């Protein structure tokens, strides 16, 4: 049910995700970026009132994030959705132009 | 953690 297209930026650098989460100061907001390294993503994110990335790896078909494995980045994202990413917090406000605009 | 956190 995560919507690739309301979070997900194949290029957006991270002090350009970090400018954008600034704007929205709410925990549980964030963003998926491509990385400039092959097969990986970051999901930059607000915990704790303050920003923060993790790394997700691409391998085969597959994307893997600490213990977890997904075979697609939406099902991740998804997954994070429900159930918590960083200490208690899910991924609960996508962030793009759009949201911001608005 | 370094620039980037671990997740749960």
């Not at chain 1, 920003?51 to 980045?73: A, P, W, Y």
């Not at chain 1, 159930?83 to 608005?102: T, W």
Request: glycine letters at 4%; proline letters at 5%.
């Amino acid at each position: 049910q995560a919507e690739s297209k309301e979070w997900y930026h194949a290029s957006l650098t991270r002090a350009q995700a970090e400018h954008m989460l600034m704007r929205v100061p709410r925990d549980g907001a964030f963003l998926v970026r491509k990385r400039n390294e092959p097969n990986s993503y970051a999901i930059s994110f607000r915990a704790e009132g303050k920003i923060k990335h993790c790394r997700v790896q691409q391998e085969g078909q597959t994307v893997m994030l600490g213990n977890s494995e997904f075979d697609s980045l939406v099902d991740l994202i998804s997954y994070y959705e429900k159930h918590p990413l960083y200490r208690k917090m899910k991924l609960r406000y996508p962030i793009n132009e759009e949201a911001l605009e608005k | 953690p370094g620039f980037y956190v671990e997740a749960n």
